[PDB]
Amino acid sequence: LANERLRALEDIEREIGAILQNAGTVILELSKEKTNERLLDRQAAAFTASVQHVEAELSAQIRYLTQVATGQPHEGSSYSSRKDCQMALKRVDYARLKLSDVARTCEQMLEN
Amino acid sequence: PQSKETLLQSYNKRLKDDIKSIMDNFTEIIKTAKIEDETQVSRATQGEQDNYEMHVRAANIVRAGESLMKLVSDLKQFLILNDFPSVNEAIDQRNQQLRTLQEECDRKLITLRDEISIDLYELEEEYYSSSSSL
Amino acid sequence: AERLTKSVTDFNSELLRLRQHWKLRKVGDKILGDLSYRSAGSLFPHHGTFEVIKNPLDV
Amino acid sequence: INMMEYLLQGSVLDHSLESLIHRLRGLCDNMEPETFLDHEMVFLLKGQQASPFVLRARRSMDRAGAPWHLRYLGQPEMGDKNRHALVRNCVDIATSENLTDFLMEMGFRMDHEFVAKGHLFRKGIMKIMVYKIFRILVPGNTDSTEALSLSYLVELSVVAPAGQDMVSDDMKNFAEQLKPLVHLEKIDPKR
């Protein structure tokens, strides 16, 4: 599932980057001496590319869900195995307790 | 899936509308800021109105990024909650693990039962044969 | 943006473990789960629907 | 009372068998698949009536001591368009092994034989079977068979009393909700 994790990471990164780009561009817009001419155009291009990339990634990721999507909430659960294992562990704990009590009584016997 | 299919259609519609709105807002802000002569309206008021419009547009774009962060959150939740494939595999794995654990535990328990029973047999052969005789 | 980066660089791992034990379902915006043995053939008329809220998450 | 079986039939290519099975298990009741191999032989009586009575006998080759099953499925009762399901009269009788000899001595003559290998899932009353028809290679040789086609066959069936129909509506809804992965529709047997 690490695929989804990587997707989300990329998404967040791109979003933050585009936001920073927009900030810088508007700051240079108010600037009395916009020295970053070509640089500014490059930034605009980069921001546009980033937005396009984000959109494409998002659409593809949305389809990923539709391929597994069905509306049905899904019945199948692990409740059976889990409950069984819990019961077994409790039984083993009870056995351990009884064993310890018998051991303690035997120790008492030895103590005299 | 009508419900899920309609939800997917609504998500696509929201993404397209937000992208178009953000691009239009950015273009409008750029021309307005590039700058224009004031006629009748006058800078004092026209300039203050432009400042308010730019601030409102920045607020709209900042929260249009928060809406997309919410969209990323929904993407992660649906990938984790509505991926029945992953669920099948995970359930199977946890089940196998727990079953093996339980069975190993049981084997150990039985052997113990066995060892405790042998000790009990020795004690039953003893205590019963003790002379004592109150 | 910087605020988003500060909120960008655990909820997901937690929800993943939750999937590992509860197999939850999607309705509205109040995502629910199954807390009954109705999958394992129990005819008890009771809704075992536990909610999941954002508070990295609370059940 | 008579037993009517609602059948919706659709196909899945093998390269999508994996995904289909995954989705199926995820939505269907929490069970493992049953992996069923069944050998079915069709016997027909050339009676005075133009229609020949056709009885199908299935033996599990994968299990031991499972009774042969004789099933009679008559003409379709499909009429209204607001059901999207093949409603047919169904009589199912478990039988002993001597069944073969009994039927041939009774006059019934064997027609064709097809083994079927596939998985069985049940959702409530609904039972979904994804199976592949292997045209037996040599009628005697159950061991050798010919896969009829690459695609597997998905059948969703509910056999219930004639008065019940809510279960058939549930079957139609469930098939529709399996549409993104694959399409199950009522296909008339004719051509």
Curated annotation (Swiss-Prot), chain A:
Keywords carried by this UniProt record: Acetylation, Activator, Disease variant, Epilepsy, Neurodegeneration, Nucleus, Transcription, Transcription regulation
GO terms, biological process: positive regulation of transcription elongation by RNA polymerase II; positive regulation of transcription initiation by RNA polymerase II; protein ubiquitination; RNA polymerase II preinitiation complex assembly
Entries under InterPro entries matching the protein: Mediator_Med11
GO molecular function: transcription coregulator activity; ubiquitin protein ligase activity
Compartment annotation: Nucleus
CC per GO annotation: core mediator complex; mediator complex; nucleoplasm; nucleus; ubiquitin ligase complex
Coarse class of the protein's main subcellular location: nucleus
Described purpose of this protein according to its UniProt entry: Component of the Mediator complex, a coactivator involved in the regulated transcription of nearly all RNA polymerase II-dependent genes. Mediator functions as a bridge to convey information from gene-specific regulatory proteins to the basal RNA polymerase II transcription machinery. Mediator is recruited to promoters by direct interactions with regulatory proteins and serves as a scaffold for theee assembly of a functional pre-initiation complex with RNA polymerase II and the general transcription factors.
Assigned protein family: Belongs to the Mediator complex subunit 11 family.
The name this protein goes by in its record: Mediator of RNA polymerase II transcription subunit 11
Record lineage: Eukaryota, Metazoa, Chordata, Craniata, Vertebrata
Gene of this entry: MED11
Swiss-Prot record, chain B:
Compartments where located: Nucleus
Transmembrane segment boundaries: none
Coiled coil segments of this chain: 86-115
GO CC list: core mediator complex; cytoplasm; mediator complex; nucleoplasm; nucleus
Keyword list, A-Z: Activator, Coiled coil, Nucleus, Transcription, Transcription regulation
Coiled coil recorded as keyword: yes
Example GO molecular function: transcription coregulator activity
Keyword match Transcription: yes
Leader sequence segment: none
UniProt GO BP: positive regulation of transcription elongation by RNA polymerase II; positive regulation of transcription initiation by RNA polymerase II; RNA polymerase II preinitiation complex assembly
Subunit structure: Component of the Mediator complex, which is composed of MED1, MED4, MED6, MED7, MED8, MED9, MED10, MED11, MED12, MED13, MED13L, MED14, MED15, MED16, MED17, MED18, MED19, MED20, MED21, MED22, MED23, MED24, MED25, MED26, MED27, MED29, MED30, MED31, CCNC, CDK8 and CDC2L6/CDK11. The MED12, MED13, CCNC and CDK8 subunits form a distinct module termed the CDK8 module. Mediator containing the CDK8 module is less active than Mediator lacking this module in supporting transcriptional activation.
Family named by the database record: Belongs to the Mediator complex subunit 22 family.
Name this protein carries in UniProt: Mediator of RNA polymerase II transcription subunit 22
Swiss-Prot record, chain C:
Organs and tissues of expression: Ubiquitous.
Record's subcellular location: Nucleus
Subunit structure: Interacts with GATA1 and PPARG. Component of the Mediator complex, which is composed of MED1, MED4, MED6, MED7, MED8, MED9, MED10, MED11, MED12, MED13, MED13L, MED14, MED15, MED16, MED17, MED18, MED19, MED20, MED21, MED22, MED23, MED24, MED25, MED26, MED27, MED29, MED30, MED31, CCNC, CDK8 and CDC2L6/CDK11. The MED12, MED13, CCNC and CDK8 subunits form a distinct module termed the CDK8 module. Mediator containing the CDK8 module is less active than Mediator lacking this module in supporting transcriptional activation.
Function: Component of the Mediator complex, a coactivator involved in the regulated transcription of nearly all RNA polymerase II-dependent genes. Mediator functions as a bridge to convey information from gene-specific regulatory proteins to the basal RNA polymerase II transcription machinery. Mediator is recruited to promoters by direct interactions with regulatory proteins and serves as a scaffold for the assembly of a functional preinitiation complex with RNA polymerase II and the general transcription factors.
Sequence similarity: Belongs to the Mediator complex subunit 17 family.
Name recorded for this polypeptide: Mediator of RNA polymerase II transcription subunit 17
Recorded name of the encoding gene: MED17
Positions spanned in the full protein: 164 to 245 of 651
Swiss-Prot record, chain D:
Keywords linked to the UniProt accession: Activator, Nucleus, Phosphoprotein, Transcription, Transcription regulation
Pfam name, any one: Med18
Cellular compartment(s): Nucleus
A GO MF label: transcription coregulator activity
InterPro entries: Mediator_Med18 (IPR019095)
Listed GO biological process terms: positive regulation of transcription elongation by RNA polymerase II; positive regulation of transcription initiation by RNA polymerase II; RNA polymerase II preinitiation complex assembly
Entry keyword annotation includes Amino-acid biosynthesis: no
Record bears the keyword Transcription: yes
Residues modified as Phosphoserine: S51
GO CC list: core mediator complex; mediator complex; nucleoplasm; nucleus
Family: Belongs to the Mediator complex subunit 18 family.
Function: Component of the Mediator complex, a coactivator involved in the regulated transcription of nearly all RNA polymerase II-dependent genes. Mediator functions as a bridge to convey information from gene-specific regulatory proteins to the basal RNA polymerase II transcription machinery. Mediator is recruited to promoters by direct interactions with regulatory proteins and serves as a scaffold for the assembly of a functional preinitiation complex with RNA polymerase II and the general transcription factors.
PANTHER family the record matches: MEDIATOR OF RNA POLYMERASE II TRANSCRIPTION SUBUNIT 18, MEDIATOR OF RNA POLYMERASE II TRANSCRIPTION, SUBUNIT 18
Official protein name in the record: Mediator of RNA polymerase II transcription subunit 18
